[PDB]
């Protein structure tokens, strides 16, 4: 009735009103408005775009479509990192302890979910005894005291976004700057964050396939965050190749422990710092990025970041001695190398497919009620740019299974070697203002 | 997925192939493809548009989506006319006998439908005893014998177009040159016509409301016709004001009778000849529009037009004495003049709203559950660009009801008077080749 007019407005490129947008969102949420109108409207948006102002109102409408987490009791400026997927991305594990060591409040809400590897709870619960068996008041007290904690995600956060994305996927309206940017910021504002850091991924193995688009989507999200009082910043990092060497769960925790001691991979280290700096700044604990970086690099060297991880673990029941002795983490039975069939420099490592290969070991959930094996995964022995002689291992598979032929195969199909090869820029672009 | 890829292809301005299009049409018709995909696709069509090849494939996809009538048993080239909706339009009542009298096979398929006045069949009810339904044999016999017959559109001709229209209407994708050009041509090609004449309206009333867009839609529909070998021509006629004086059913039959004697209103007469000329040329009963026109004007003055009308009425049970004696047509109870409040020239007769006013007397159907009163209607006393004194009748309301104050008010509010005015050119342009 009124939807059809809003669609036609949108066709002509007319900037919708706050109430018009809220009518669609709530009408679509409660089942008043059917999906053929929603999809029609989604495509209309795809072509004629939305203003910075329509974005901010759409974003906020989706927040209010379901529950809103109030973290007013938690003290300080709580900054929340969002990443746009990334194979082997260990930043979340490192960042929460690292940033809390500088008295920045980290109120993590995380899950398990489906993917190449497990969620942050899955990965953390490889630390013997660790749990999220705790209330909201327990959660609030721990963040106020030790500046870090993690609970499970709530059920009903932005059910508008859930249904919209699902429609967008099956109508090809996913790739839209206003819809993506709103969809993301909505989940993070509903989750109760004050400020937000974004890790928008780019490269051959990324959702925003080009840096042109990456920087635009990121810029769109900053301006949304600023237009609703949520100071936002953004990194454009590369994901043509997996981040670090560890692709797994126990493997990635081991790698997080290394980076917490200043002993991480070149790439994971750098990204952790860049992202960490943005957070530390967003909670008024430094003036500029370099000072934050210095402070963060100090707490790596201090072992204070590392002790903040142990505190955090023992606060939630995890055996903190496992941080000191990583070999206590669940071990894989078999340890199988994948040797180069060729000499040269490693030119290409198809991130997602290496991710898939690790999933095939048991490391992630292909379906709703699959079970993760925390021990299994892939440790990269070479990165894009390293030399390699025929027979030298590119990769070591970690399995509780003798037969890994399908996995070895997927590794070879997705690691190319050439005469020369230059590793892409990891950190492309930061967006502050 | 398939459909998603088809949608995305179109998003990027790629030409759909023939198989993709059939898959969609067959899929959406049978129920495989859901409504939200269909709506997202049409919205993609709307923006990126299609090519002549795609339009042709879409058209024919829609033709084959249901049953097809095969008039091959009727000898000669069976040309058919389609008008894009016009208030007071009686050209079909005139053309069918007028062109059949020149030995052009009119195998007309018409419907009742909703709107301002009733359809062609509704109008033909006014001659008592006339009926629409007789057999496909009785249809084929009568056209070979007398070159003229009218039956109902029945079953599912273009079931894809039935469903997709409703979708386009309720999703705001009705105004797309590809979609309507196909929608029109499909239903016509499906009805068994060899050649097609299109009366594409323009002006205040009618869906297309500019001479540029009207020609664009026509040139598209002609091209599709020539592409599929169904030789097609078009008339761009004006419809900012109603056609002739008579707006109704019994009233429009009377007006069509006058026109058949060459005693019609100027505009109706001119539109008839232009449309007729085209039909005669497409039927190979003249080499020249000039020649064709002349034959049609001879047959009007002869009586041969009017005798063919009588023949046609007798063939389908109609009391053909009503032609010779108009007062036999169902008369109206009341006959109210609407006096002008102002001296001047009549500048504006808002065609669609006058059609509504006539509807409010009982001459059309707002909803499917209404019944037409055939007696009622509106006789215009002035056309745009006529001098009118204060107190002179602009309009006469033929009613079967005493209180008609809303109808009077609507007439006043949709007929403006000014110092000077000229009506548009009736015949704007023609698409011959
Ligand atoms: Na890693």
From Swiss-Prot, chains A, B:
Binds 1 K(+) ion per subunit. It catalyses: uridine + phosphate = alpha-D-ribose 1-phosphate + uracil; thymidine + phosphate = 2-deoxy-alpha-D-ribose 1-phosphate + thymine; 2'-deoxyuridine + phosphate = 2-deoxy-alpha-D-ribose 1-phosphate + uracil. K(+) binds at residues 88, 90, 243, 246, 255. Phosphate binds at residues 81-83, 92, 108-110, 120. Induction: Induced by deoxyadenosine and thymidine. Repressed by DeoR and glucose. GO terms for cellular component: cytosol. SMART domains: PYNP_C. Substrate binds at residues 168, 187. One of its GO terms (molecular function) is metal ion binding. Pfam families: Glycos_trans_3N (PF02885), Glycos_transf_3 (PF00591), PYNP_C (PF07831). Keywords: Glycosyltransferase, Metal-binding, Potassium, Transferase. One of its GO terms (biological process) is pyrimidine nucleoside metabolic process. Its EC number is 2.4.2.2. Homodimer. NCBIfam families: PRK05820.1, PRK06078.1, Y_phosphoryl. Belongs to the thymidine/pyrimidine-nucleoside phosphorylase family. Catalyzes phosphorolysis of the pyrimidine nucleosides uridine, thymidine and 2'-deoxyuridine with the formation of the corresponding pyrimidine base and ribose-1-phosphate. This is Pyrimidine-nucleoside phosphorylase.
């Amino acid at each position: 009735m009124r939807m059809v007019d809003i669609i036609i407005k949108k066709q002509n490129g007319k900037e919708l009103t706050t109430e018009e947008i809220q009518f669609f969102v709530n009408g679509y949420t409660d089942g008043s408005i059917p999906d053929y109108q929603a999809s029609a409207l989604a495509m209309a948006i795809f072509f004629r775009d939305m203003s910075d102002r329509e974005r901010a109102d759409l974003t906020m409408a989706m927040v209010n479509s379901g529950e809103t987490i109030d973290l007013s009791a938690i003290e300080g400026i709580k900054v929340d990192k969002h990443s746009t997927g990334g194979v082997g991305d260990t930043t979340t594990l490192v960042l929460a302890p690292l940033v809390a060591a500088l008295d920045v409040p980290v109120a993590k809400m995380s899950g398990r979910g489906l993917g190449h590897t497990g969620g942050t709870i899955d990965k953390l619960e490889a630390i013997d005894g660790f749990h999220v068996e705790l209330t909201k008041r327990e959660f609030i007290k721990l963040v106020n005291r030790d500046k870090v904690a993690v609970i499970g995600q709530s059920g009903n956060l932005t059910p508008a976004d859930k249904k919209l994305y699902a429609l967008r996927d099956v109508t090809g309206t996913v790739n839209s700057i206003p819809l993506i940017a709103s969809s993301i910021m909505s989940k993070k504002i509903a989750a109760g964050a004050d400020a937000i850091v974004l890790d928008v991924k780019t490269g051959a193995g990324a959702f925003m396939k080009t840096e042109e688009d990456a920087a635009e989507l990121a810029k769109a999200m900053v301006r949304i965050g600023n237009n609703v009082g949520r100071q936002t910043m953004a990194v454009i990092s590369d994901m043509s190749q997996p981040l670090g060497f560890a692709i797994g769960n126990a493997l990635e925790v081991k790698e997080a422990i290394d980076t917490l001691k200043g002993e991480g991979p070149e790439d994971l280290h750098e990204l952790v710092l860049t992202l960490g700096s943005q957070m530390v700044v967003l909670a008024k604990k430094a003036d500029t990025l370099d000072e934050a970086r210095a402070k963060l690099e100090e707490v790596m060297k201090n072992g204070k970041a590392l002790e903040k991880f142990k505190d955090f673990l023992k606060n939630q029941g995890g055996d903190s001695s496992i941080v000191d002795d990583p070999s206590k983490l669940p071990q894989a039975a078999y340890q199988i190398d994948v040797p180069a069939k060729e000499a040269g420099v490693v030119s290409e490592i198809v991130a997602d497919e290496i991710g898939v290969a690790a999933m095939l070991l048991g490391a992630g959930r292909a379906t709703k009620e699959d079970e993760i094996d925390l021990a299994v995964g892939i440790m990269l022995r070479k990165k894009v740019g390293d030399k390699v002689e025929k027979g030298e291992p590119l990769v070591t598979l970690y399995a509780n299974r003798e037969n890994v032929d399908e996995v070895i195969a997927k590794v070879y199909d997705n690691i190319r070697i050439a005469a020369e090869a230059k590793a892409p820029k990891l950190i492309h672009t930061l967006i502050t203002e």
